[PDB]
Structures are given as C-alpha cells and as structure tokens.
C-alpha cells in the first residue's frame, strides 16, 4: 502498495481505494481502474514536469463526514492514488505525525484508516 | 505569492523558506538557489514522471524544539519548496483542515 502513511481507504464508486493522503495535491487522483472517463481534461503540474490528464465521470465517495459526489483526475503515471486538499477539506481531516508514522483523524476525533 | 495552505516558514541555512507542507512528499525539497550541492543524486518520481535531482549538502534547519541538520532535494521543476514526511516526523506535526484552509501545529497543538 500500500502507499506509505498517512493513508486512508475510502469506498469510491462502490470499491475500496487506498489513498496516500497528499496535502500537496490540489485535486484527488485515481491511478488504475478509474471507471468511465470524461472527455474533459486538465493540465497537471507535478514536482518533475507536467502533462494533460482526463477527469473521471462522477463517483460517490463515502467520507466519514458523509457521502458526496466527486470527480478524480486519472493519472496512470502517478505511483499511488492521492487524496488531495479537495477531499481533505470535505473531511475536515487532521493528520498527526507520531512515531515514524502518521495517522488520519476525523473532525470528531475518530481515527480513520 | 505564497504556496497554498497548509504552509509553514522555517529557517534553512539561516534564512526563512516558506514551504508547502506536503504529506505526499517522501523527502523535503528546495527549488531555487539552493546553495552547495552534494555530488549525490536521487531518482524522484512525481505525479507525472521521474528523473534525477541533486541532493544539497547538509543544512541547519531551525525547527520548534531546536536545530537539526538535514539535506534537501533540489528540484527546480517543482513550483514550491516542499516540507515532506521526513521533516513532518521530526516536527511531530499535526495538520488540521478547518474552514476552507489548513493549519500546521506542533505535537501539542502549538503553532510553528
């Protein structure tokens, strides 16, 4: 895999996806089996370069704060699915660095995994 | 223009750097006039591709609890310096998403 901590598993379009929690990602990313793709695209700047990628169609995403509809960037070049600031804002997540690891906590203090 | 939240300003080599706090980064990154470089490099995989970048020599970094010595990747293709999981562990940081933004605090909720 799995991605390193901090990580979280969410149901996305009926399937579990384990994400790296990525506060440096403006938008969230699926890497494999993204489901149906839109023909809308975006220019994505990464740390090492940039490229054009397509958006998925809408997915239901089961956040601890309640299910919402979300579209993901499909980035098959990316090493892990990424949960970015778009969904972290909806989750009102806290990310705590403790030991050599990191734990995600919800806005009610409940541990998320 | 600062990087987006969550962000933090730390002294590196004696002068402040405003980083994007990036839990997706394995190691911390400088982007511009990084100072002396090592002869060593790393392969860096980003969201869109990979290539090699040079390590800095050691830098004095002023954290909350005191100075550490740390090396950074110099990645001039990256739009912002990144404070990654390497230094977030050393800071024992917490990152809180509240309202539309995000704040970074210490292990017991003090600002940095």
């Amino acid at each position: 895999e799995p991605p390193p901590e901090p990580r979280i598993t969410l149901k996305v379009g009926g399937q579990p996806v384990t994400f790296l929690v990525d506060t440096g990602a403006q938008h969230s990313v699926l890497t494999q089996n993204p489901g149906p793709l839109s023909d809308k695209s975006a220019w994505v700047q990464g740390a090492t370069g940039g490229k054009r990628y397509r958006w998925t169609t809408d997915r239901k995403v089961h956040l601890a704060t309640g299910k919402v509809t979300h579209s993901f960037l499909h980035v098959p070049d990316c090493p892990y699915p990424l949960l970015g600031r778009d969904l972290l804002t909806k989750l009102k997540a806290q990310i705590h660095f403790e030991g050599s690891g990191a734990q995600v906590v919800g806005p009610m203090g409940q541990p998320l995994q | 223009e600062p990087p987006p939240e969550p962000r933090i300003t730390l002294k590196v080599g004696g002068q402040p750097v405003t980083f994007l706090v990036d839990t997706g980064a394995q190691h911390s990154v400088l982007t511009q006039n990084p100072g002396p470089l090592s002869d060593k490099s790393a392969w860096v995989q980003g969201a869109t591709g990979g290539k090699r970048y040079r390590w800095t020599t050691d830098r004095k970094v002023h954290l909350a609890t005191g100075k550490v010595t740390h090396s950074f990747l110099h990645v001039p293709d990256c739009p912002y310096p990144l404070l990654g999981r390497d230094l977030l562990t050393k800071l024992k940081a917490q990152i809180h998403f509240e309202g539309s933004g995000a704040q970074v605090v210490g292990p017991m909720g003090q600002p940095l």
Binding site: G24, A25, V44, Q45, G46 | A25, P79, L82
Partner: peptide, 4 residues
C-alpha cells in the same frame, strides 16, 4: 505535488 499536483497543481492544475
């Protein structure tokens, strides 16, 4: 990382 990812910026549009």
């Amino acid at each position: 990382x990812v910026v549009x």
